[PDB]
Design a protein around this ligand. Structure first.
Ligand SMILES: [Br-]
Ligand SMILES: [Br-]
Ligand SMILES: [Br-]
Ligand SMILES: [Br-]
Ligand SMILES: [Br-]
Ligand SMILES: [Br-]
Ligand SMILES: [Br-]
Ligand SMILES: [Br-]
Ligand SMILES: [Br-]
Ligand SMILES: [Br-]
Ligand SMILES: [Br-]
Ligand SMILES: [Br-]
Ligand SMILES: [Br-]
Ligand SMILES: [Br-]
Ligand SMILES: [Br-]
Ligand SMILES: [Br-]
Ligand SMILES: [Br-]
Ligand SMILES: [Br-]
Ligand SMILES: [Ca+2]
Lengths: 226, 226, 226
């Protein structure tokens, strides 16, 4: 019936396990595309796994570092870690590469890309709210925390590369923001303004509309450069 | 009348906003002199701003990292962040470059350099005292914390460079300490000895004399290689 | 009489000062062998000392970083820091290089290598137990913490190099684990399984047998490539 009331259901969909799985699948597919990633999975499987955990848990790691909490606090969520580990294992080692083939099938891939954005927006909003809880007027801390929750491993890409034995210092995601990093920055500003009560919208409505924006943008981009 | 009583007034001058402004002006001028900095402000203004915040808040960031606190805790001081942001904006984007011209005028520049040293010494002493509060006999933690409060962004210079897309690993400020880094190390030893009660001087008198030493050294150096 | 009762004495030998000294001696000998280390001790003695502290306190530094504690918390143990500092000073600056000559004498060196492994295993077990205390079911945090307590400075080797002015990003200890790093990973899994109560052995017996394994392996390796 009511929109802000469908918005409430949208903004509270349980992200574990299905939306988290989609987030992991899309993120580990991106890892498998990186130069040298398949050979690394064969010669250095622990590091390859460590790399997938970053792609999977980089948002949490970086937010925890910014706020002074254990950077591996999120790895206490055993079920999530094991689910991400299963995704890594299936994408790199499934017989016949069958799992890769199924999740890369473009209609399926686009649904996972859409689901990944649901998770990303929830993470941005959670970062703003968690920072606000610790710093009620900490606008810059709220923005920084929402930003790294959204952007994830991209903001640590120089060190994800280092882990892989790669060093490209000429560029980084702050000096040259990719679209998801820039979108996450706009998103964190919006959620911080909503948290400040200067943006006159319900949090659920902001989640709904910003998620739809990210879904449309990301699905379009995936479908176009396929 | 009494010196240790003028020393008390000296050591308690309110550093916000005027001495902090001078600290920011001198530090962002240094940023503007770094290779590529003006072009970065035009092509990557967020990163340029991020870079100025490091120059501005590197002391706090590093001390917080050493002590296990949020490395962005200091960014909860909204007024300070906004003041530093105004300084960055004026130095890089003022029409006619007028702000740069005024603050670079050598007599004005030297006064800001003097004021910057007032802030630096207060920060060193505060780092020793804050570490002492957490570790009453933690001599090495007191020295480490006073040192990074004094030295600031210089000790993270390899990563300030990385942010700018620059990587010079051959050298760093520990392997080859510049004068302010070395002076900050001597300063942190003195304040730690004062805190230990092995150096028989009042804290205010130590602040006065060490600040005068840094002012004389820094103003001489600025005026000479102008 | 009883083995698990000799195991109790073995697992509770006071590591300070003698086993810690051996740990420091072996670790700083390794530092002195690294390219450029002697010249660095003459031209950059503070950084050389800073480097020895990493070799000495890297386990604690990294575990503290992983758990969100002060990375220099361990430097509050003044006696340990001063003992490590004496070892650094004697190894690099003793007249006639006499201390180096004595501790490098192969029978003496092998005893110190054995003693170093006693300390390493105790550190792994302590890391698992300390992580368990904070996260009763935090299996991945327990493994990560035991691993860096065992592996020590090796896992930060890229940044130990950076401190020395060296940058080799092609390789790292996760992508290509050395034997002690890999052994520490196996060790942390065993202690975590013991902590979980899935490995039916007393903690003291596990300490005894895993320490004997590391002693045999490390003494063999030192004696062979001497
Ligand atoms: Br790459
Ligand atoms: Br491996
Ligand atoms: Br979240
Ligand atoms: Br969060
Ligand atoms: Br408050
Ligand atoms: Br992405
Ligand atoms: Br530079
Ligand atoms: Br930008
Ligand atoms: Br301060
Ligand atoms: Br402080
Ligand atoms: Br105490
Ligand atoms: Br300076
Ligand atoms: Br090397
Ligand atoms: Br030195
Ligand atoms: Br320990
Ligand atoms: Br520990
Ligand atoms: Br619990
Ligand atoms: Br070793
Ligand atoms: Ca902390």
């Amino acid at each position: 019936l009511q929109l802000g009331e469908l918005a409430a259901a949208f903004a509270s969909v349980p992200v574990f396990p299905l939306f988290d799985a989609a987030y992991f699948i899309v993120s580990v597919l991106y890892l498998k595309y990186e130069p040298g990633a398949v050979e690394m999975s064969r010669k250095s499987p622990f590091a390859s796994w460590l790399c997938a955990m970053l792609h999977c848990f980089g948002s949490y790691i970086l937010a925890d570092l910014l706020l002074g909490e254990s950077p591996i606090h999120y790895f206490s969520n055993n079920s999530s870690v094991i689910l991400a580990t299963a995704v890594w294992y299936l994408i790199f080692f499934c017989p016949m590469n069958l799992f890769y083939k199924c999740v890369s099938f473009l209609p399926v891939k686009l649904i996972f890309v859409a689901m990944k954005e649901v998770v990303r927006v929830r993470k941005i909003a959670a970062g703003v709210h968690h920072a606000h809880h610790q710093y009620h007027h900490g606008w810059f801390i709220m923005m920084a925390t929402g930003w790294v929750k959204g952007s994830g491993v991209a903001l640590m890409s120089n060190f994800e590369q280092l882990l892989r034995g790669v060093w490209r210092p000429e560029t980084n995601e702050i000096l040259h923001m990719s679209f998801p990093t820039k979108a996450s920055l706009y998103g964190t500003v919006l959620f911080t303004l909503q948290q400040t009560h200067w943006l006159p919208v319900s949090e659920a409505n902001l989640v709904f509309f910003f998620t739809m924006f990210m879904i449309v943008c990301k699905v379009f981009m995936t479908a176009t450069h396929s």
